[PDB]
């Protein structure tokens, strides 16, 4: 009834997230289309690039430098002669206007640029001039002292004909293309990178799954209304309680409403400005479904046979939070120590990100023989540091390894005490 | 006696699985022959391929494309001139009939194929035409817009002379060979792959181990009859119980009968249609032997000294199943969250398979510094997602890491309570 | 008040270590400048080198040998013709004086060197002669029997112009450069290595963040004085106690004073002789901040709600130390066994360092499938050793894996006993 | 006194194993000399080989095949022209006599060899003829159908001059050299391998560390006599006990005597037939030192403060052994299942060795994301097997992961019961 409505919401959002996962399978075939094309154009425009080169597809020779510039130049020259896909290029100007290239060799470098490190002097008008060469579909050089970044933009149209095997009418992708020689460091290591976007549109010459999605949206709307009614019942009970864990009979419903509104927003409203907002709204729906599973397990406990494990979660977080505070203090201190130490020798130490990176290497064991090994293998320097690195790292290792089972089993015996009360 | 018959079945299936493992050692030398030949023909027919290329042995140049086509063409040309093995090719037609090639350059591509993405149009008779060129042992081109898949089939005969070192008469392998340029994506990334089968037959000019296997089969038949008699005794006891864990005094015997019938079926009956059915029946025999070990440990407990550990398994699954339900709900929710999130950036996220892939990375530590590292290293995009990815992944990490020791030690103290009852 | 002063010290050193982490972010951008340049010159001077070559960028051909010598020779020849950076080279002699090169082809090899292994004889004046060729910015051979080591030194000046994007005036780096062909083994495997240092100086033509750092230093001085006053109070209490854990109300303050003096020394006094002393003093500040977090957690426990977890650490170390002694005895014995065994086959066994390396492979799981796998894969030798290696390694594996949870959960139940006393 | 003699034995074997570790450091520098030379000759004789090639340095082309043969041929031709070491070759015949080569191109292939797989026939006199070409220091072909294995033997002398930096007189190594093209499979994948030994001898023109080792040996002899006296005391106590854990007051002494006799045997007696017997005797000494640490910890417990942890080991093995029997039954069954399953798709499944390989992947986490990942990535076949592989592997994973903490914490609470008795 009313719990039949709740379980209907459970299966209904379950089917809606099944439709989400269906949307995911379809868009995932599509994004496989994306990635196929992505590595594709990487081959395609790419000159001298390699598999795995994304770590280091970067230049030393200026003759190297212009080499790739021309290489892409010819690629734009001769793509229809050469490829295996079917790219199409109509006018499509950017990113600065005027007019349409479609290959725009863009170059930004500073407007005032006197630079003589031999006299130890420089005079820089840090305003940057960008010269662009428009390249009509059927050579010029830049100062290496002068450079900031060099850009090729170009876009190619195609139709995902593989959607016939998905029984669908094919769609039109337009992959926009920014190849970049980049020297923001200005250090000599000119990284090249190809980035791309794509517009998906329907064919020029041209919905039951979409109707089923719309019906799912309407069902989600009815479910959110049911959540609103249940919350009004809970609020009337709260007004009676004021006048007179399990944690989520309200709150999970509110999260579900957030997910449902997110899905509605993803279907239509922000769906005319979709892509990233669609991704984030999927981000919302996931927690909704996670709550869907969780409260499904709560309600489908049916007391779980007396819910001993349900109550087991209860007492410990009362200790576990302060213990969490303490251990996190330990974690942050270890993090500060990393923020100090790793600069002398580390790739795994690179930023506060990499500091977070060390922390999994705490709890997990993947990086220890990696890192604690190889740093001991000593790229190294300044052998007191080589002592001190062992001094730090072995010290970091043992502490949580002992004490964390201490915390978990301490609250374990805490729940053992919660089973000392609770096993009777 | 009767338990001597059971232990005789234990050692008898133990010897039969020793014979299975013997069959495994022999077939494993053989399948090493398979794999040796497999990498072999991969070298052999393969042109431009590499070690490790199986990740990416795929094409960009159409001139690349025909290059490999010709490369294999010459390989079929000149194998006896060139090789280190001894391949033999007699008529052997396929896969479509008429007649015998033995090198069949097969090409499938659609029968109606107007495709112009520049006008945003296409007219496809999705019926596919396949042209095949038969290549008699002692060049033509395909439309790149037009292609679907391109196939070379060829088969080579040889005799595993290395079986003389196994003291056996050598056998005849016929490796059938499908090299394929594949463009089912039609995206430009034409993967090539060589797949092969082989027929093993006896020599044209031509059994005590086979007799010992047959005797093992007869012994397995006697053991299954003993299991049938013991089950009739148990069923008469059940009829007396109706008229009036340890779990497997029947059920393990029934599994053993399944394994024994599977082995009998693998020896003879489906042995005239063997290979995969033989593999699956080995799949059966393994669980039989696993049960063989397990019930061996049960019976050879001899009460295990009072079987405290035997009874230890008893009480906990009563809690552990519902707890398993709960944690699996947690697992499935995390899985849905993966099914959402990873599409923006992941190889480890690729499908529900890869979703299962994340789960070991939960319990194990191999992938954390891998994945939680490198995704943080941010191929990335849309930096709110870069926040949110950390937001998801660190969140996924801690939860089971805490609570799973909670579950295990909660049932641990549960068995501690089962030892609180049971340690006295 | 006085605890407001302590928390002000907590936030004050917190901000000072925030300034440390700020100094770290700034110097880390700089050291990224270092590493960018480092891989740079590695490309730059490097001839025939590769990515990943640092494992094996070493020679076999003498024609190989001179090849790289000339390769660097031309690099010094033609750097301004070729590069992407802006290197500058003024006189700058070294490492022996007289005068200035700036490219010094240095070669050391023994002064008396009769070596005939065919007669099994050698007469070596182990004094070494070093010939050096000074190479003025705009070929000679060495005996391969005769060689000891061959060295190129050269230094290049540049200005880190990328600091304009950090809104700073750019600085002058001078990268000093030692490329070395090294044959101290004299075995034929001539490793080459490029090592570099750099002097950072201000520009020739030329401080509020520095003033804020100085104010932070003065605040640290006031905090150390507050620590000195609190220690005088504690010492007067100790004099009253003599006349009549929590562990760090003194000791953490003393560590903080050490860190504060270290930071003061890093700011000014040893700051005229900085780099490694600066690194070590950062080494000091880290433990200070770690203590900062820890005692922050102590004081901000506020009894932690009765500090059950604080007292939890108390009783166990009384057992844990002797248990630690015992397990470490186990560890050292395993270490001796490694020191024996691995010489026949191991890279992971290389030294007492690598012995420490095995120990993480104990507690962690990263190397097991690596090492216990691949050594079983048997580079190997002397198959009794192949048995014995399994005999050792599987033996090493299980012992701690069982017993260490034994120790941790034994003190776990010890703290369970400490919660048996302490859960009431 | 007498315990001073025992602790003197502890420190004395400690110093003797320090001398063992010293011998290890010295021989390890030497074996580094070995490995340096090993990769050396691998470069040296090796033609077309690569770094990492040891996985796959194997042939396809017969023109490839002879290519390397000649390549080594010229290497023997022109080593003194080319190298960086100092190799010396005097007569040194082998492995068959008559006379001295020193480069012996040896080829074994069967004496009767009619092989026609096209007629499905073969007539093999499995006696093998070996033709050898002696190559005097300053081309012929083999049937590819006919081949079995092809061998080059050659030996080079040199003096480890790097021992002058160890302050020692240098020694004479003679590296004997077997390069082998091997086709025992006869499948076409002719693996090449270079194996080498070396004789270490003193110089032709020519001991306080050796005297200190001899004194250590005499001290070990006195310690073994003390162990014999203590065992005679224990045996007289046993004779009084018959007439009327801690486990190793005898037994550790007996192990120590075994180690001491092993060291004495390694010093002199079998030291005229040393190398592998020396390795094995080091194998003995290690367990001696391990016992040295262990009983050191026993005696230096001094009751360990009441030896609660010493007694903690006591009760549990009484359960742990039968539990170990049970879990090992589980392990063996999983092992049989592997022995079945992996043949269809695995490198990690290769033999009972690799079966042991899976087991660490059980307890450790290194291989899970590796193997359970990549096998799911499906080289694969026969998709019911693809289901069944997941069916097996996920099943293998969870079982020990749950139950093993069950066993450890079950005996943990067992020792908790042993601390329930033992914490009072």
From Swiss-Prot, chains A, B, C, D:
Nonselective cation channel probably playing a role in the regulation of membrane trafficking events and of metal homeostasis. Acts as a Ca(2+)-permeable cation channel with inwardly rectifying activity. Proposed to play a major role in Ca(2+) release from late endosome and lysosome vesicles to the cytoplasm, which is important for many lysosome-dependent cellular events, including the fusion and trafficking of these organelles, exocytosis and autophagy. Required for efficient uptake of large particles in macrophages in which Ca(2+) release from the lysosomes triggers lysosomal exocytosis. May contribute to cellular lipase activity within the late endosomal pathway or at the cell surface which may be involved in processes of membrane reshaping and vesiculation, especially the growth of tubular structures. However, it is not known, whether it conveys the enzymatic activity directly, or merely facilitates the activity of an associated phospholipase. Induction: Up-regulated by nutrient starvation. GO terms for cellular component: cell projection; Golgi apparatus; intracellular vesicle; late endosome; late endosome membrane; lysosomal membrane; lysosome; membrane. Keywords: Adaptive immunity, Calcium, Calcium transport, Cell membrane, Cell projection, Cytoplasmic vesicle, Disulfide bond, Endosome, Glycoprotein, Immunity, Ion channel, Ion transport, Lipid-binding, Lysosome, Membrane, Phosphoprotein, Transmembrane, Transmembrane helix, Transport. Disulfide bonds join 106-132, 172-203. Glycans are attached at residues 139, 149. The most N-terminal extracellular/lumenal domain (referred to as I-II linker or polycystin-mucolipin domain) contributes to a structure with a four-fold rotational symmetry in a tetrameric assembly; the structure contains a central highly electronegative pore with a 14 A diameter. The pore is critical for Ca(2+) and pH regulation. The protruding structure formed by the I-II linkers may contain all the interaction sites with lipids and proteins in the endolysosomal lumen. Belongs to the transient receptor (TC 1.A.4) family. Polycystin subfamily. MCOLN1 sub-subfamily. The lineage of its organism: Eukaryota, Metazoa, Chordata, Craniata, Vertebrata. One of its GO terms (molecular function) is sodium channel activity. The keyword Protein biosynthesis does not apply. It is a multi-pass membrane protein. This is Mucolipin-1. A motif (Selectivity filter) lies at residues 364-369. The gene is Mcoln1. The chain crosses the membrane at residues 6-26, 210-232, 246-266, 278-300, 323-343, 387-408. Residues 352-372 dip into the membrane without crossing it.
